[PDB]
Each structure stands twice: as C-alpha cells, then as structure tokens.
Amino acid sequence: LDPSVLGQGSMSTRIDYAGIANSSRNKMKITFDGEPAKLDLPEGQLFFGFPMVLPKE
Amino acid sequence: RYGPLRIKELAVDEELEKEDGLIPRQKSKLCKHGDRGMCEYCSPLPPWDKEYHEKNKIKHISFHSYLKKLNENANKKENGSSYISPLSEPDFRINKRCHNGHEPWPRGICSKCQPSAITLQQQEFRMVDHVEFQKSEIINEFIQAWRYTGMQRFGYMYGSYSKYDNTPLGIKAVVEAIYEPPQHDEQDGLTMDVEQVKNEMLQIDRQAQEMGLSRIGLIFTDLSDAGAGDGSVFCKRHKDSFFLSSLEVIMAARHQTRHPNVSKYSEQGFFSSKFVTCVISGNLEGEIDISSYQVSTEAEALVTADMISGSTFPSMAYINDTTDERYVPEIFYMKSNEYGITVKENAKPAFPVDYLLVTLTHGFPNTDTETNSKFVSSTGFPWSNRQAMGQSQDYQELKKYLFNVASSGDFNLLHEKISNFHLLLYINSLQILSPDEWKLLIESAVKNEWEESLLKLVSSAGWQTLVMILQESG
Amino acid sequence: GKKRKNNLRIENNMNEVGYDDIGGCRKQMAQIREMVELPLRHPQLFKAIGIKPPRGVLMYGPPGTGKTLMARAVANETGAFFFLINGPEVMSKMAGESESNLRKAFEEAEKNAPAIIFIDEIDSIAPKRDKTNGEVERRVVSQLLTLMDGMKARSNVVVIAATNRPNSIDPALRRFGRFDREVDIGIPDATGRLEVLRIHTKNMKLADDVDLEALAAETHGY
Numbered sequence: 001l002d003p004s005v006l007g008q009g010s011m012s013t014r015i016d017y018a019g020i021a022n023s024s025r026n027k028m029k030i031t032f033d034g035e036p037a038k039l040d041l042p043e044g045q046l047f048f049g050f051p052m053v054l055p056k057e
Numbered sequence: 058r059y060g061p062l063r064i065k066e067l068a069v070d071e072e073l074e075k076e077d078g079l080i081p082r083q084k085s086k087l088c089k090h091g092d093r094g095m096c097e098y099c100s101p102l103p104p105w106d107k108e109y110h111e112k113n114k115i116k117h118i119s120f121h122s123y124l125k126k127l128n129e130n131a132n133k134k135e136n137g138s139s140y141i142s143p144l145s146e147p148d149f150r151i152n153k154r155c156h157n158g159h160e161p162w163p164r165g166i167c168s169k170c171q172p173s174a175i176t177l178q179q180q181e182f183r184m185v186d187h188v189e190f191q192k193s194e195i196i197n198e199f200i201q202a203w204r205y206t207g208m209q210r211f212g213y214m215y216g217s218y219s220k221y222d223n224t225p226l227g228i229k230a231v232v233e234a235i236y237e238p239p240q241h242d243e244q245d246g247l248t249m250d251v252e253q254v255k256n257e258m259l260q261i262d263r264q265a266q267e268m269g270l271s272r273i274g275l276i277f278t279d280l281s282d283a284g285a286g287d288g289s290v291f292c293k294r295h296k297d298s299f300f301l302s303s304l305e306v307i308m309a310a311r312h313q314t315r316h317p318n319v320s321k322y323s324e325q326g327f328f329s330s331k332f333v334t335c336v337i338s339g340n341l342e343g344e345i346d347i348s349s350y351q352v353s354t355e356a357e358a359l360v361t362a363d364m365i366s367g368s369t370f371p372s373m374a375y376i377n378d379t380t381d382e383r384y385v386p387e388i389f390y391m392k393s394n395e396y397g398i399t400v401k402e403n404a405k406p407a408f409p410v411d412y413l414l415v416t417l418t419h420g421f422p423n424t425d426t427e428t429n430s431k432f433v434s435s436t437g438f439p440w441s442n443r444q445a446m447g448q449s450q451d452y453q454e455l456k457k458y459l460f461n462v463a464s465s466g467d468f469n470l471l472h473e474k475i476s477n478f479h480l481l482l483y484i485n486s487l488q489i490l491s492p493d494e495w496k497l498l499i500e501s502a503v504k505n506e507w508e509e510s511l512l513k514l515v516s517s518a519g520w521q522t523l524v525m526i527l528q529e530s531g
Numbered sequence: 532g533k534k535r536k537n538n539l540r541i542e543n544n545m546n547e548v549g550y551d552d553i554g555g556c557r558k559q560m561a562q563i564r565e566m567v568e569l570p571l572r573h574p575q576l577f578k579a580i581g582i583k584p585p586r587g588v589l590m591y592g593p594p595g596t597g598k599t600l601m602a603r604a605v606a607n608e609t610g611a612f613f614f615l616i617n618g619p620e621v622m623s624k625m626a627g628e629s630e631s632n633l634r635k636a637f638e639e640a641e642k643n644a645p646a647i648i649f650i651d652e653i654d655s656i657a658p659k660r661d662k663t664n665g666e667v668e669r670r671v672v673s674q675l676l677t678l679m680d681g682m683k684a685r686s687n688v689v690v691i692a693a694t695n696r697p698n699s700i701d702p703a704l705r706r707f708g709r710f711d712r713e714v715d716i717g718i719p720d721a722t723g724r725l726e727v728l729r730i731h732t733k734n735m736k737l738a739d740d741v742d743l744e745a746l747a748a749e750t751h752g753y
C-alpha cells in the first residue's frame with residue numbers, strides 16, 4: 001500500500017543500507033532497535049532512504 | 058592600550074555594534090525609592106536577558122547580544138588587562154609542533170599538547186536570527202521542480218543581510234534568488250560533483266557580487282507524497298525522530314567553515330559564518346512547510362578535524378578512531394535530566410545530533426507592498442541547469458520571451474522583463490555585450506532609477522546587435 | 532521650594548525623607564553631607580584646589596540608629612541619581628547573578644553621573660573572611676573589590692555602605708581607593724531623644740498632658 005521507496009528504492013539498492021544494518025546486527029526487516037553502524041558517504045551526497053517513523057499521534 | 062583589530066566587516070555588523078539594545082522598564086510596584094533612582098526591578102534590561110527571551114518565546118540570544126554580554130562581563134576599561142580578545146573559535150586539532158622535550162605527536166606526546174576531552178552542549182546563541190524570502194515564487198519554482206520531475210532538488214540562495222527588530226539586536230537574511238548547480242537528483246537522494254560545483258560557483262559568485270548579491274545558504278527538498286488523492290506529503294521529520302540527518306549536518310558544517318564571518322573581536326578575525334540551511338519536508342498536518350537550521354560553532358570545529366561521520370541511524374552521528382594523523386579525545390555530551398541536574402554521558406559509539414543544531418525562524422514580507430525586492434521575476438525565462446526537464450535556455454526562448462517587448466517599446470514592460478536574475482546570467486554567458494554594456498544593463502535592471510540607463514542600453518550598439526541577431530535567429 | 536520642589540512640601544515609596552526627618556545626629560549628618568554633596572554639587576572646588584574627592588564612605592553603628600534613614604535622606608536631598616543595593620537582596624539570587632546585579636548597579640550609576648550607590652547592609656555580601664564559607668561569598672567579594680577599585684578618577688560617583696561593626700566586613704574593603712572614610716553612629720543623648728520623640732509624635736493625636744522632656748530623660752540607651 002505504501003510506496004516502495006519508503007525503505008527500499010534508488011540509492012538504497014546502490015548503497016546497501018539493508019546490508020549495513022543487518023551486518024551491524026550480526027556483528028529482511030529494518031528497525032531502529034539495536035545500535036548504529038558507521039555509514040560513510042562521499043562528500044556531496046544526501047541520503048533520504050531511512051525508514052519512515054511517522055508522527056507519534 | 059590595544060583594542061579590536063582594524064578589519065572591515067559588513068555594514069550590518071557595524072550598525073548593530075553601534076546600538077546598545079537596552080530594554081527599559083517602568084517603575085515596578087515593588088520599588089522603594091523616589092522618582093530619581095532605581096534599585097533592581099527598574100534598571101534597564103540587558104539585551105541578552107534570558108528571562109525576557111524565555112518569556113517572549115525566543116530560543117537563542119541574537120549573537121550580537123552575546124558579544125555585548127561577553128564585553129560587559131570582561132575587559133575592564135582603563136586597567137586590569139590589555140584587551141584579551143573575547144571571541145575565539147574552538148580548535149580540536151592536535152599541536153603538531155610542541156617540542157616540549159619530545160618529538161611530534163606520532164612518536165611522543167605530553168599533557169600540554171594532548172587535546173582535552175570535548176563536552177558537547179547545545180549552543181545558546183545564533184548568528185542569523187531570521188530568513189526572509191522576498192516572494193513566494195522563489196520557492197514555488199523550486200518546489201515546482203520536484204512536482205514535475207519527482208526527484209529531489211538542491212540549490213544555493215543568494216541575497217543579503219539586514220537588521221531585524223523583532224528580536225534584540227537580531228539579523229535577518231533576505232534571499233532574492235536561488236541558483237541550482239548541476240546535480241544528479243535521485244528518488245531517495247541527490248548527488249553532485251564537488252569540483253564542478255565549486256568551479257561554476259566561483260564565476261557565479263563573481264557575477265552576483267557585480268550585481269550586489271551574495272551566497273548566504275543552501276536549500277534542498279525532502280518530499281515523499283502520500284497515497285491520498287489530494288497533494289499531501291508524509292511528515293518524516295518531527296519531534297521524536299530526526300530534524301536534520303547526520304550527513305546534511307556534516308555538509309552544512311563544511312559550508313559554514315568555507316564562508317567565514319569576518320569579525321573584529323577574534324584573533325583569527327572570523328567567527329561562526331552567517332550561513333543558513335533550509336529544508337522543505339512538510340509539517341505535522343501534511344503540508345509543504347519549510348524549516349531553517351544552522352549548525353553550532355563546535356560542530357563546525359568538529360568536522361574540520363574529521364572526527365564525525367554519518368550513521369545508519371538517521372538521528373545519531375558516529376565517531377572515528379585515533380589514527381596516526383587525527384587524534385580524537387573522549388567526547389561527552391551534556392544533558393539536563395527531569396530533576397534539573399546536568400548529566401554527562403560518554404558517547405563514543407554514537408550521539409544524537411540535536412546538540413549540534415540551532416533553529417531559526419523563516420517568514421515572508423508582509424502583504425504591504427514595500428517592493429524592496431531586486432527582481433520582479435522568478436516566473437518566466439527558465440532557471441539554471443534544469444536540462445533534465447524541458448527548461449533549456451537557448452536563443453529560441455529569448456526570441457519568444459524578450460523580443461516582443463524589445464520590438465514595441467513600453468520601457469516599463471521592457472524593464473520588468475529584463476529584471477530576471479537568470480536572464481541576466483544567461484545574457485552575460487552569451488558574452489555578446491561588452492563589460493561596460495553589461496554593467497549598465499545590470500544597473501538598469503536592479504536600480505530604482507533605470508529610465509536613463511534603460512534608454513542608454515537600448516540605444517547602445519551592443520544591445521542593437523544583440524536584438525538584431527535575436528530577431529534574425531529562428 | 533524644599534526637597535527639590537502642598538505640592539511643594541512647604542505613595543512615593545520611602546521618599547520625601549529629608550533632613551527634617553532626622554534628629555540628634557548633626558555631627559554625623561555634617562560629615563556625610565561634606566563627603567557626599569560637595570563632590571557632586573560643586574565639583575569645581577576640588578578641580579580648583581587639585582584633589583580627588585573621596586569615593587567610598589563607610590557608615591556603621593548599632594541597629595536602629597538610622598543608618599538607612601540617613602543615607603536615603605542624603606540621597607533624596609542631593610537631588611542626584613542613586614542606586615539602592617540591598618545585601619540580602621543581592622545574596623538571595625542564583626549563582627552568577629549576584630555579581631551581575633553588582634556590575635549592573637555600578638555600570639548604570641556610572642552612566643547617569645552624578646550618582647550615589649547605597650550598598651545597604653554590606654556586611655552580608657562581603658563578610659569577614661572566616662565566615663566566607665564557599666566559593667560564592669568569595670566570588671561576590673572579589674567582584675565587589677574589582678568594581679570598587681576600577682571605578683574611575685573622573686566620574687562623579689560616590690558609594691555609601693552601611694554595616695553594624697567595623698570588624699564584620701572583609702578587611703580588604705577598608706584600604707586606599709575604597710571605603711577609606713568611615714562614620715560612626717552612637718546612641719543619642721537626651722536632646723537627641725527629645726528631637727526623635729518630637730519627630731515621631733507629630734501626627735499622633737496627643738493629649739495635653741504630655742511631657743516629652745520627661746520621656747527623653749527617662750529613656751536612656753534608646
């Protein structure tokens with residue numbers, strides 16, 4: 001029902017955000033439960049592919 | 058007695074420095090004294106009074122007032138010092154040349170040249186207090202880019218600074234036009250070659266300065282329309298989640314470091330660039346509201362020595378290691394708990410970026426027609442490098458836009474067609490007009506007195522050749 | 532007319548206290564007037580002779596003797612700007628704000644010269660070293676010392692302080708360029724007590740059988 005770009009779109013299949021998250025886990029569902037892992041992107045790139053959390057409501 | 062150094066700073070800074078900013082108070086009912094005199098409740102309120110700000114719902118103290126507070130606290134007159142400079146930007150890089158009896162850092166180090174532990178803490182002042190867009194079209198076109206293409210966008214905003222009376226000794230950046238560099242926007246993000254961007258922006262800045270503008274910030278869109286029938290966007294950024302992700306905070310810090318704010322009260326001569334960053338994401342109700350931010354002076358001094366990187370968690374920024382070049386001490390971020398006690402927590406793995414931000418307030422000029430804008434434009438001739446869409450500047454577009462007015466007269470109509478920022482840049486790039494012709498063109502298009510200059514231009518040989526070739530071209 | 536003026540006196544909190552509301556302290560009153568009014572009212576005398584008028588004027592005595600009354604009367608009579616500082620009031624504020632109030636007092640008094648800064652109950656903000664417990668009392672004492680020392684040479688500003696005993700104040704406050712001149716107030720004699728009784732028992736609806744002289748004679752140590 002939601003657009004696929006909400007977690008997996010362009011620049012998420014290029015930069016394996018899912019891969020980074022799961023490899024940090026074992027150190028596919030993505031959640032902010034756990035710990036962060038370094039995600040270093042080159043100067044001049046902005047990433048907006050983080051999973052949406054919506055307002056508290 | 059030595060004092061502030063001799064260095065030229067913006068007119069706004071000077072005129073702010075001239076003022077005192079004191080807030081007078083009337084006789085309180087708790088005063089015990091006659092008409093002449095004043096005890097503690099009637100004395101003028103300093104411009105930096107925290108109670109006044111928190112009572113008026115102001116979250117920061119208008120940097121010039123912070124400088125006033127520092128000057129009042131320190132630097133006694135006529136004795137007690139030789140004018141210790143009050144402002145000094147943080148610097149965390151290790152002292153590569155200590156030689157206190159030991160070789161440089163890689164193979165020896167003492168307690169004197171060892172960076173001390175860094176304590177992050179929310180900044181209490183903001184350089185620029187307001188950001189004002191002269192017209193709605195400036196951002197309407199910027200968002201029309203996304204509406205038509207579906208990808209994100211990114212562009213620098215040109216303008217100038219001025220006073221802001223709604224806050225004690227406050228500054229507002231007024232933005233006149235937006236320039237979009239060549240960038241490859243994408244569904245979830247955007248990319249842009251740094252070298253091309255800076256090489257183009259050098260000449261763009263030269264031309265803008267010739268026109269009187271300046272580069273004062275960057276703006277990007279973060280929009281993802283919801284599935285509802287109407288035009289609405291998800292509220293991705295809000296209180297509990299991130300406002301600015303780590304990557305954009307880092308980029309903003311770099312931009313601020315590259316645009317230093319020349320100041321007369323610091324040893325280096327600069328302090329905390331007046332560079333703002335705006336983002337278009339959408340408010341809690343599902344609109345296209347816009348928000349403006351600015352990274353603190355310690356984040357600005359943290360990114361320079363690397364020491365930070367983006368993290369897979371949007372709200373938290375990672376920390377690098379103690380390699381053989383960059384030496385990172387222990388970083389603590391200070392917070393106050395619900396019981397009104399400050400608590401220091403070590404954050405080596407990752408810490409929230411909310412301690413590296415200060416929030417500004419945007420707005421638009423009141424509906425009252427002041428017409429202090431430099432351009433009646435932003436709706437017409439296509440903008441900068443939007444070759445992805447059908448917006449491709451070329452001679453045909455000129456022949457269709459700026460030829461009927463030049464073939465009839467109506468000097469007012471010609472003036473309102475000639476006052477387009479991007480049109481001026483394009484005709485400059487055409488290089489048909491000689492430098493003096495272009496100087497008189499810009500002063501005809503931007504100055505409130507343009508009749509004589511417009512007549513001289515239209516009568517000029519260069520303009521005549523330009524219009525003749527434009528007519529001949531099809 | 533009078534008091535820098537029914538409207539001429541021939542609300543207003545603790546105001547209208549003049550020289551006619553003080554009785555039995557004419558020697559101390561003369562000393563205070565000489566120390567305060569002359570430097571402010573007629574600065575040309577000291578420039579002509581070529582001296583610097585005194586800045587600090589300490590004043591002490593037993594409680595109830597009228598130190599605050601005398602200071603307020605002088606301030607109101609001189610017709611010159613003045614700035615009340617109350618020791619307990621300054622010391623009842625969060626850390627780092629007592630010094631702010633002291634600095635504001637001195638700077639604002641300097642702005643509107645001529646001025647009189649009346650530091651009432653100075654023994655509570657600059658107490659004796661042994662009882663300066665903590666780093667807040669020491670900090671406020673140091674701030675007061677800084678302001679007192681660095682004031683100026685040309686500014687027409689006078690500082691008046693009231694306390695109970697000479698030994699209740701930090702010794703560092705009684706040096707050159709500080710509270711150097713000091714005045715002592717003692718219990719009044721019979722004539723002084725008679726004058727005080729006359730002052731207070733004026734609005735009262737006294738009966739004809741009153742012997743205020745007898746009360747003055749009977750009240751010793753009052």
Ligand SMILES: Nc1ncnc2c1ncn2[C@@H]1O[C@H](COP(=O)(O)OP(=O)(O)OP(=O)(O)O)[C@@H](O)[C@H]1O
Pocket residue numbers: 552553554555556593594595596597598599600601651652693727730
């Ligand atoms: N000649 C006088 N000497 C003393 N007190 C007088 C005199 N005439 C009137 N009074 C009254 O006596 C009381 C004196 O109290 P006051 O606060 O002046 O004394 P204080 O203990 O020196 O002051 P403070 O504690 O505020 O420094 C007041 O009611 C004042 O009105």
Ligand SMILES: [Zn+2]
Pocket residue numbers: 085087088089090094095096097098099100
């Ligand atoms: Zn008052």
Ligand SMILES: [Zn+2]
Pocket residue numbers: 155156157159166167168169170171
């Ligand atoms: Zn060393």
